[PDB]
Amino acid sequence: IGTKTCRQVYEFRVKESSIIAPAPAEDVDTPPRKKKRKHRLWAAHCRKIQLKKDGSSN
C-alpha cells in the first residue's frame, strides 16, 4: 500500500501489537526426520486395506 510509509505503520503495528494479542508464530519439525517410511509398508498398508474389504471389488 503506497498510502502510508513503513514508519507510523511499524508504529501502527506497535499500537496494533499493544491492542491485539501477539501472534503465535510457532514453527514445527515433526518427530520424524527421514527413513522409517518405506513405500512397501504403504503397499503393506494397502494390502491390509485390500484384504479387509477391497477383496469384493464392487
Partner DNA sequence: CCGTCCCCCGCGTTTTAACCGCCAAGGGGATTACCCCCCAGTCCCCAGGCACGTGCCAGATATATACATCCCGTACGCACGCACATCATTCGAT
Residue 13 or residue 45: which is nearer to DNA going by CB? 45
Binding-site residue total for DNA (CB under 7 A)?
Answer: 4
| Distance in angstroms (rounded) separating the CA atoms of residues 32 and 34 | 6
- Matching residue, cell 514508519: 7
Cα 56 from chain centre: 36
User: Per the structure block, which three cell numbers stand in for 50?
Assistant: 485390500
Residue 39 or residue 53: which is nearer to DNA going by CB? 39
Residues of this chain, 20-49, that bind DNA according to CB under 7 A = 38, 40-41, 44
Interacting residues with DNA (CB under 7 A): 38, 40-41, 44
